[PDB]
């Protein structure tokens, strides 16, 4: 038994709630909250930029020192960081940016990160300003990701969509 309420079962382990996955953390608390990040963990926009600002920048800052250290990410990899005030820990992980370019194959490697976690609180990788179709990534998280996956989708209207078209 976990912390998670009103999520709908999609499968085994995937669970999916319309959210801001903001307000869902600062309730939850949960052990790993996944950011939707850029290789150079610039938190500017998007779920990255709404994780950061509800930190006060305390994200950017110990990401800053971070790629200081161990320079950029990899497209389809990620780090472990501090969860701030919203979790205990924070997994930034780099799903393609199809308005970068980047190969959409990509996107299944960056879910595979969320099987080091056996539980976790995540958005849609590659969704919304990362340009990929929120329904092929709701596919690939459900054929890619083995452990307990709750996401948190900030738009009531893909949500519906999302949950109307799951196969």
């Given at each position: 038994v976990n912390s998670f309420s009103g999520y709908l079962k999609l499968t085994d382990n995937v669970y999916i709630k319309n959210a801001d996955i903001v307000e869902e953390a600062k309730k939850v608390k949960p052990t790993v909250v996944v950011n939707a990040a850029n290789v150079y963990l610039?938190?500017?926009?998007?779920v990255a930029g709404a994780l950061n600002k509800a930190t006060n920048n305390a994200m950017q800052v110990e990401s800053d020192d971070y790629i200081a250290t161990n320079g950029p990410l990899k497209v389809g990899g990620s780090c472990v960081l501090s969860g701030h005030?919203?979790?205990?820990?924070?997994?930034?992980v780099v799903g393609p940016n199809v308005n970068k370019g980047e190969?959409?194959?990509?996107l299944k490697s960056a879910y595979e990160?969320?099987?080091?976690?056996?539980?976790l609180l995540a958005?849609?990788?590659?969704?919304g300003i990362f340009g990929a179709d929120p329904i092929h990534s709701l596919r690939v998280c459900v054929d890619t990701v083995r452990t307990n996956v709750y996401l948190a989708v900030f738009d009531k209207n893909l949500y519906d969509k999302l949950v109307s078209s799951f196969l």
């Open positions: 610039k938190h500017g926009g998007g005030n919203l979790a205990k820990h924070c997994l930034h190969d959409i194959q990509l990160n969320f099987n080091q976690h056996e539980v958005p849609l990788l590659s969704a």
